Every structure is written in structure tokens, then in C-alpha cells.
Amino acid sequence: MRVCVIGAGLSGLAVGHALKERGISFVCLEKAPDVGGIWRQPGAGERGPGYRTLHLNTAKQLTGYADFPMPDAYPLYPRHSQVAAYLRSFAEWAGLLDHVELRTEVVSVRQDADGPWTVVSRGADGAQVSRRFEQVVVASGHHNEPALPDPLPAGADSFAGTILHSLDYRDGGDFAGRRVVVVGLGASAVDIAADLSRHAERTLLSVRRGLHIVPKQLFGMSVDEIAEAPWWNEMSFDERRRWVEQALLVARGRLSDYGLPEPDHPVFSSATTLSDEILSRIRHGAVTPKPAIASFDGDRVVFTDGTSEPADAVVYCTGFHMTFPFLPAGCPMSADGSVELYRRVVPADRPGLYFVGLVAPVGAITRLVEAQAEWVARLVDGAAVLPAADQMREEIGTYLTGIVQRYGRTEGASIQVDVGPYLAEF
Numbered sequence: 001m002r003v004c005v006i007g008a009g010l011s012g013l014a015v016g017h018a019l020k021e022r023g024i025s026f027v028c029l030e031k032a033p034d035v036g037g038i039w040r041q042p043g044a045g046e047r048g049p050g051y052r053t054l055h056l057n058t059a060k061q062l063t064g065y066a067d068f069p070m071p072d073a074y075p076l077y078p079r080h081s082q083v084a085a086y087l088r089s090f091a092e093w094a095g096l097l098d099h100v101e102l103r104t105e106v107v108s109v110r111q112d113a114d115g116p117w118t119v120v121s122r123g124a125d126g127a128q129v130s131r132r133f134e135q136v137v138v139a140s141g142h143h144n145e146p147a148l149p150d151p152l153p154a155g156a157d158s159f160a161g162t163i164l165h166s167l168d169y170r171d172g173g174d175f176a177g178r179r180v181v182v183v184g185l186g187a188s189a190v191d192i193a194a195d196l197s198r199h200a201e202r203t204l205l206s207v208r209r210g211l212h213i214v215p216k217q218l219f220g221m222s223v224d225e226i227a228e229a230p231w232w233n234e235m236s237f238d239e240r241r242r243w244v245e246q247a248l249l250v251a252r253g254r255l256s257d258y259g260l261p262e263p264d265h266p267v268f269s270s271a272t273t274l275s276d277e278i279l280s281r282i283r284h285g286a287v288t289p290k291p292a293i294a295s296f297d298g299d300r301v302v303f304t305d306g307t308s309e310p311a312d313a314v315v316y317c318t319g320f321h322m323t324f325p326f327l328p329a330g331c332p333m334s335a336d337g338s339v340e341l342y343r344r345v346v347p348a349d350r351p352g353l354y355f356v357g358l359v360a361p362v363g364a365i366t367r368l369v370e371a372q373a374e375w376v377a378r379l380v381d382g383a384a385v386l387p388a389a390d391q392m393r394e395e396i397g398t399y400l401t402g403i404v405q406r407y408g409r410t411e412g413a414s415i416q417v418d419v420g421p422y423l424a425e426f
């Protein structure tokens with residue numbers, strides 16, 4: 001009645017918990033047959049950003065909800081199925097599921113001239129019902145639309161095999177004995193290449209721009225555990241860079257010597273891909289680093305180095321586009337494509353709309369959405385207040401002009417957040 005929460009992944013669940021703890025009435029509308037967001041999608045053979053080898057790359061005690069620790073027997077890096085079971089178990093404990101409408105997909109969201117939002121959902125029956133809510137919290141995730149490169153390499157339409165995205169990818173088993181090209185050097189790409197490296201006859205890793213490939217662990221410490229260590233925050237943002245790049249070279253050496261393009265920037269600058277596997281896979285010949293794909297010649301994939309390989313499939317791990325089809329005008333955005341959300345949550349012109357989980361921190365997103373949810377709940381029932389709109393576009397302004405200072409234009413830096421200072425403001 002008061003709050004329609006769109007999404008029952010980790011963020012929607014935190015919002016529902018936050019609202020339930022303030023006595024605030026809400027319903028949570030979720031597409032999938034259950035809660036958990038992406039973490040339950042592999043496990044149901046569902047097409048989504050995950051895959052059957054997906055584990056957390058953040059430590060469990062930093063990723064679990066603050067008031068609801070993951071089972072003690074869980075490893076540091078739980079499998080997607082353990083996370084999904086954890087999330088379902090959270091919804092049960094927090095008393096959330098009777099406020100959750102499963103198999104219910106939100107299709108339009110419009111602000112009515114009196115303040116309330118009209119929300120049109122489509123259910124199992126394919127039927128549609130239109131409802132009014134005081135406020136709407138968007139918790140729909142930002143891995144919604146696959147982002148293929150533009151353009152495809154030439155000859156893609158004549159390709160003998162399957163051109164697919166990591167969305168359509170679930171299990172390397174589905175490629176047993178086949179010759180597959182993985183495109184990308186991000187979390188998805190190295191994981192899916194690693195996974196193909198034990199079922200495919202041959203796995204090729206086609207990379208164009210170089211990324212810093214960091215183990216999940218230095219000094220035995222998870223990289224996001226170190227990020228919190230006082231002695232690391234004790235350190236200067238150049239003293240740490242050197243610490244990291246010296247540590248990296250003791251642990252893996254230099255990327256060029258694994259056949260990988262060396263990045264054009266230090267660590268932190270741009271982005272870092274986490275993997276314990278992909279370098280070793282290369283050194284074992286299980287994955288073969290290749291340059292960029294330049295053309296598809298029938299059954300073969302031709303690379304920019306003139307070399308060529310027969311390939312039965314190409315798996316594009318080029319990331320995801322952030323879209324909001326149910327929002328007619330869409331996430332408040334800048335011409336540049338930069339998100340414009342006051343403190344990464346709040347549109348400046350539309351009262352009663354909130355975006356939760358649309359941040360990208362170094363490490364786990366959980367503490368951040370827990371703080372976001374707690375703030376939004378206090379805004380919904382009035383314990384907290386927003387600046388005037390101009391003043392909200394000013395925080396947006398200095399946050400944005402500050403991300404160009406750190407990442408220049410990039411493309412998805414408009415949701416990047418320092419996990420330390422952000423949480424401190426809550």
C-alpha cells in the first residue's frame with residue numbers, strides 16, 4: 001500500500017527488511033519464481049548474468065546482511081546456490097515473503113499529478129493489473145540488457161556456429177568437446193573461459209583492451225578484507241598503489257608474460273578483474289589468449305593478428321546495459337549517460353522514487369544497500385528529508401565532476417562509489 005518495491009534480489013530484500021522494521025506498508029514485486037535476484041538464476045537454468053561456476057568474489061562475512069550472518073559452514077566465497085539459499089532464508093527470517101509477489105513483473109511506472117505512482121504489473125496469467133502506491137523503490141538491478149560490441153565483427157551473419165552472450169551462457173558442460181571463443185576480460189569473461197577450459201576441446205580468450213587481473217587474495221587476505229584493514233586505510237593512495245602493484249608482481253608477475261595485453265593505467269584506475277584461475281589456465285594451455293576478433297570466416301574466427309581458429313561458438317562477455325523499461329523517461333540521466341541520483345539514490349525532480357543497489361563499490365554491495373534501504377525507509381515515513389532540488393543537482397554535480405577526475409569519461413563510472421566514505425554519511 002505505501003511502498004511498491006520493484007525487485008526481490010539482495011537489494012529489494014534489504015528494502016523490504018528496512019521498511020518492515022519501520023512498520024511501513026509495502027509490497028515487493030519480483031519477476032522470477034523466487035527471491036534472490038541473479039544468485040538464484042543459475043540453479044534454475046535461467047538466462048541471466050550468472051553461470052553455474054559463479055561464486056562470490058567478496059568475503060562472506062562482508063557480504064552477508066549485517067544482522068543475518070551466512071551459515072558458519074559456508075566458505076569464504078560461497079557458490080551461487082549457497083547465496084541463493086541464504087537470500088531465501090533471509091526473506092523467511094525477516095518475515096518478508098507475505099509482502100512479496102513472485103512471478104510478477106512491473107511493466108509501467110508513472111507519477112500521477114497528485115504524487116502517487118501508478119504501477120502496472122504483469123502476473124503469471126500474463127494478465128495486467130494497475131495499482132497506485134505512495135512511493136516506489138526501484139531495486140531491479142543494473143544487469144538487465146546484454147551489451148554486445150558495436151558492431152559485430154564482419155561475417156557474423158555467415159557464421160557457422162553460435163554467437164551468444166554470457167546472459168545466454170549457463171554451463172560449460174553445454175560446450176563439451178566444442179571449440180569456443182570467449183570475448184572479454186571481466187569477471188564474467190575470465191570465469192566463463194576458466195569454466196570452458198574444463199569442458200571445451202579448446203577455449204580461446206579474445207581480449208582487446210587490457211585489464212588488471214587480481215587474485216581474490218593477497219597475504220591470504222581477501223582483497224576486500226584488505227580494503228578495510230586499518231593499516232591499508234592508514235596508507236596513501238600512492239603508497240597503496242605501490243603496495244598493490246608490488247604484491248601483484250610477487251603473486252602473478254606481469255600480465256604481458258601470460259599473453260595478456262598490459263593495461264594503459266595503474267590499478268584502481270579503470271577497473272580490476274578478480275580471478276584465482278585464469279592466469280594458471282593460460283599457463284596450462286587450457287585457455288589461449290588471443291587478440292580481438294576481426295571477422296568470422298564460415299566455421300573459423302579470424303583475429304586481428306592474422307591468426308585464425310575454427311570455432312563452434314563465441315560467448316560475448318562484454319557486460320550489460322543498465323536499463324529501466326518500466327520507467328517511461330528512465331533513470332534520471334545526463335546527456336553523457338551519467339546517472340543523476342542525489343547520493344546515488346534519489347532523483348531530484350521526482351519525489352517518492354528511489355533507486356537502491358545502483359552503486360558499484362570496491363567490494364561487496366551489501367553494507368551499501370543496507371544503508372540505502374535504511375535511509376529510504378526514513379524518507380518514506382518522514383524521519384528524514386531531502387534538500388531542495390537545485391541543492392540535490394549540486395551534490396550530483398560535484399559527485400560527477402569528481403568521477404571524471406578519477407575515471408575520466410569511461411562509461412559506467414556514474415555509479416562508482418568509495419565504500420568507506422559513502423557508508424560513513426549513513
Ligand SMILES: Cc1cc2nc3c(=O)[nH]c(=O)nc-3n(C[C@H](O)[C@H](O)[C@H](O)COP(=O)(O)OP(=O)(O)OC[C@H]3O[C@@H](n4cnc5c(N)ncnc54)[C@H](O)[C@@H]3O)c2cc1C
Nearest residue numbers: 007009010011030031037038056057106140141357364365
Ligand atoms: C557475475 C556477477 C558477479 C557478482 N559478484 C558479486 C560478488 O561476488 N559480490 C558482490 O557483493 N556483488 C557481486 N555482484 C553484484 C550483484 O549485483 C549484487 O551482489 C546483488 O546481485 C544485488 O543485486 P540487486 O538485488 O540489486 O539486483 P539483482 O540481483 O539483479 O535483482 C534485481 C531483481 O529485479 C527483478 N525484477 C522484478 N521486476 C522487474 C522488472 N519489472 N524489471 C526488471 N527487473 C525486475 C529481477 O527479477 C531481479 O530478481 C555480482 C554481479 C554479477 C553480474
Ligand SMILES: NC(=O)c1ccc[n+]([C@@H]2O[C@H](COP(=O)([O-])OP(=O)(O)OC[C@H]3O[C@@H](n4cnc5c(N)ncnc54)[C@H](OP(=O)(O)O)[C@@H]3O)[C@@H](O)[C@H]2O)c1
Nearest residue numbers: 149183184185186187188189206207208209317318319320
Ligand atoms: N563481480 C565483480 O567483481 C564485478 C566487477 C565489475 C563489474 N561487474 C559487473 O558484471 C557485469 C559482467 O561484465 P564483466 O564485468 O564480467 O565484464 P566487462 O568488464 O563489462 O567486460 C570488459 C571487456 O569489454 C570489452 N569491450 C570493449 N569494447 C566494448 C564495448 N564497446 N562494449 C562492451 N564491451 C566492450 C573489452 O574487451 P573485448 O572487446 O575484447 O571483449 C573488455 O575486456 C558487468 O556489466 C558489471 O556490471 C562485476
Ligand SMILES: CC(C)=CCc1ccc2c(C[C@H](N)C(=O)O)c[nH]c2c1
Nearest residue numbers: 057214223224272361362363364365
Ligand atoms: C584491493 C583491491 C585491488 C580490490 C579490487 C576489487 C575488489 C572487489 C571488487 C568487486 C566486488 C563485487 N564483486 C562488486 O562488483 O560489487 C568488484 N570489483 C572489485 C575490485
